[PDB]
């Protein structure tokens, strides 16, 4: 249907983060470069290409777990609250229905939302 709209990937994680920076001038400078960086470089590859709307708790836990195996708990952590800061602003326009980072309370140790397949 995206040939009827006016721009094919829209509400996608990459285009609302652009705007959540766009709207962020809070931290400095030079840090919210490097924070921008870090988005580029590990939080839009995999979920920035997706429909937000789609995107599980799973999806979400992918760009984590990357960096989280990555070996930079810090890292991890802070774009855990970047993105914190995107669902929610991606909540208040619709795209998604709550924040997967808030949903998952860290009850299932793996990327699905069931311990028990069946």
């Given amino acids: 249907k995206s040939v009827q709209e006016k721009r094919n990937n829209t509400r996608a994680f990459k285009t609302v983060a652009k ?3 766009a709207t962020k001038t809070t931290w400095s400078e ?14 839009f590859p995999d979920i920035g290409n997706k429909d937000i709307a789609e995107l ?24 855990k609250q970047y993105a914190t800061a995107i669902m929610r602003y991606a909540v208040q326009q619709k795209m998604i ?9 860290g009850a299932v140790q793996k990327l699905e939302h069931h311990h028990h397949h069946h």
Avoid at 30 to 43: A, G, K, M
């Fill in 19 to 21: 705007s959540w920076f």
């Fill in 30 to 43: 030079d840090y919210q470069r490097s924070v921008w960086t870090r988005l580029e470089t590990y939080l």
């Fill in 56 to 79: 599980d708790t799973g999806d979400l836990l992918v760009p984590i777990k990357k960096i989280e195996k990555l070996g930079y708990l810090e890292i991890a952590m802070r774009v």
């Fill in 97 to 105: 229905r709550f924040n997967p980072a808030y949903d998952l309370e």
